[PDB]
Design a protein around this motif. Sequence first.
Motif, PDB file in Angstrom:
ATOM      1  N   UNK A 195      -2.480   0.656   8.852  1.00  0.00           N
ATOM      2  CA  UNK A 195      -3.583   1.282   8.144  1.00  0.00           C
ATOM      3  C   UNK A 195      -4.084   0.387   7.006  1.00  0.00           C
ATOM      4  N   UNK A 196      -3.372  -0.704   6.700  1.00  0.00           N
ATOM      5  CA  UNK A 196      -3.805  -1.646   5.676  1.00  0.00           C
ATOM      6  C   UNK A 196      -4.504  -2.838   6.325  1.00  0.00           C
ATOM      7  N   UNK A 197      -5.289  -3.556   5.521  1.00  0.00           N
ATOM      8  CA  UNK A 197      -6.137  -4.650   5.975  1.00  0.00           C
ATOM      9  C   UNK A 197      -6.191  -5.739   4.906  1.00  0.00           C
ATOM     10  N   UNK A 198      -6.328  -6.996   5.334  1.00  0.00           N
ATOM     11  CA  UNK A 198      -6.381  -8.162   4.452  1.00  0.00           C
ATOM     12  C   UNK A 198      -7.689  -8.902   4.709  1.00  0.00           C
ATOM     13  N   UNK A 199      -8.536  -8.987   3.685  1.00  0.00           N
ATOM     14  CA  UNK A 199      -9.859  -9.584   3.799  1.00  0.00           C
ATOM     15  C   UNK A 199     -10.131 -10.525   2.632  1.00  0.00           C
ATOM     16  N   UNK A 200     -11.041 -11.472   2.855  1.00  0.00           N
ATOM     17  CA  UNK A 200     -11.409 -12.455   1.852  1.00  0.00           C
ATOM     18  C   UNK A 200     -12.908 -12.421   1.612  1.00  0.00           C
ATOM     19  N   UNK A 201     -13.327 -12.989   0.483  1.00  0.00           N
ATOM     20  CA  UNK A 201     -14.712 -12.973   0.047  1.00  0.00           C
ATOM     21  C   UNK A 201     -15.048 -14.348  -0.502  1.00  0.00           C
ATOM     22  N   UNK A 202     -16.243 -14.837  -0.192  1.00  0.00           N
ATOM     23  CA  UNK A 202     -16.677 -16.157  -0.597  1.00  0.00           C
ATOM     24  C   UNK A 202     -18.085 -16.062  -1.178  1.00  0.00           C
ATOM     25  N   UNK A 203     -18.126 -15.521  -2.389  1.00  0.00           N
ATOM     26  CA  UNK A 203     -19.317 -15.406  -3.213  1.00  0.00           C
ATOM     27  C   UNK A 203     -19.089 -16.207  -4.491  1.00  0.00           C
ATOM     28  N   UNK A 204     -20.158 -16.609  -5.183  1.00  0.00           N
ATOM     29  CA  UNK A 204     -20.046 -17.374  -6.405  1.00  0.00           C
ATOM     30  C   UNK A 204     -19.573 -16.456  -7.521  1.00  0.00           C
ATOM     31  N   UNK A 205     -18.894 -17.020  -8.519  1.00  0.00           N
ATOM     32  CA  UNK A 205     -18.444 -16.238  -9.663  1.00  0.00           C
ATOM     33  C   UNK A 205     -19.630 -15.822 -10.527  1.00  0.00           C
ATOM     34  N   UNK A 230     -18.120 -12.731   8.449  1.00  0.00           N
ATOM     35  CA  UNK A 230     -19.429 -12.092   8.360  1.00  0.00           C
ATOM     36  C   UNK A 230     -20.178 -12.760   7.209  1.00  0.00           C
ATOM     37  N   UNK A 231     -21.500 -12.593   7.131  1.00  0.00           N
ATOM     38  CA  UNK A 231     -22.292 -13.273   6.118  1.00  0.00           C
ATOM     39  C   UNK A 231     -23.356 -12.344   5.538  1.00  0.00           C
ATOM     40  N   UNK A 232     -23.673 -12.545   4.255  1.00  0.00           N
ATOM     41  CA  UNK A 232     -24.642 -11.737   3.529  1.00  0.00           C
ATOM     42  C   UNK A 232     -25.473 -12.631   2.609  1.00  0.00           C
ATOM     43  N   UNK A 233     -26.746 -12.275   2.413  1.00  0.00           N
ATOM     44  CA  UNK A 233     -27.634 -13.036   1.553  1.00  0.00           C
ATOM     45  C   UNK A 233     -27.714 -14.486   2.026  1.00  0.00           C
ATOM     46  N   UNK A 234     -27.677 -15.415   1.073  1.00  0.00           N
ATOM     47  CA  UNK A 234     -27.659 -16.843   1.350  1.00  0.00           C
ATOM     48  C   UNK A 234     -26.536 -17.520   0.563  1.00  0.00           C
ATOM     49  N   UNK A 235     -25.700 -16.719  -0.109  1.00  0.00           N
ATOM     50  CA  UNK A 235     -24.647 -17.214  -0.981  1.00  0.00           C
ATOM     51  C   UNK A 235     -23.375 -16.367  -0.881  1.00  0.00           C
ATOM     52  N   UNK A 236     -23.267 -15.480   0.116  1.00  0.00           N
ATOM     53  CA  UNK A 236     -22.093 -14.626   0.251  1.00  0.00           C
ATOM     54  C   UNK A 236     -21.578 -14.668   1.685  1.00  0.00           C
TER      55      UNK A 236
END
Lengths: 59, 59
Positions: free
Chosen positions: A28-38, A12-18
């Motif tokens: 019931x558990x889930x594993x997800x990743x995030x690709x935003x700048x520090x 999925x995508x958000x803004x122009x940098x996330x």
Amino acid sequence: MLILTRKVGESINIGDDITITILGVSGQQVRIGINAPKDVAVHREEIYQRIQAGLTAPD
Amino acid sequence: MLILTRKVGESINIGDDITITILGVSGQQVRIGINAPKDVAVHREEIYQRIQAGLTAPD
RNA sequence: GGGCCAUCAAGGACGAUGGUCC
RNA sequence: GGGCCAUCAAGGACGAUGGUCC
């Protein structure tokens, strides 16, 4: 609130940098990743609300 | 890239105006939501890359 | 090697660990 | 009521639909 439906391996995508990804699921558990700048904060809800309390991460 | 683990009914947070939630699971499928202002774009990866190709939504 | 379950993870890593079954 | 699988959803809703099994 916007909602979407995806499967293990999609993103999925958000803004122009996330961007966000669903690496997998474990019942019931889930594993997800995030690709935003520090340059922007990223934390769980169990700790973001303690950071924004007026403090910052520990040593 | 930052990775987290979450469970049905919990959330994650980004920046100072974005929040994300795991509404549930459906086997290999997943149900998730996004809580950002409409001042920022939010779309699936399967279409965001077609929007940013040089155009905008069909309406 | 894989299925299932639980916990940790102020972590920026496609994160870690334990239990159970084959 | 729940497990499994598939599809739609340029959608801002804690979104929808179909198949299969108990």
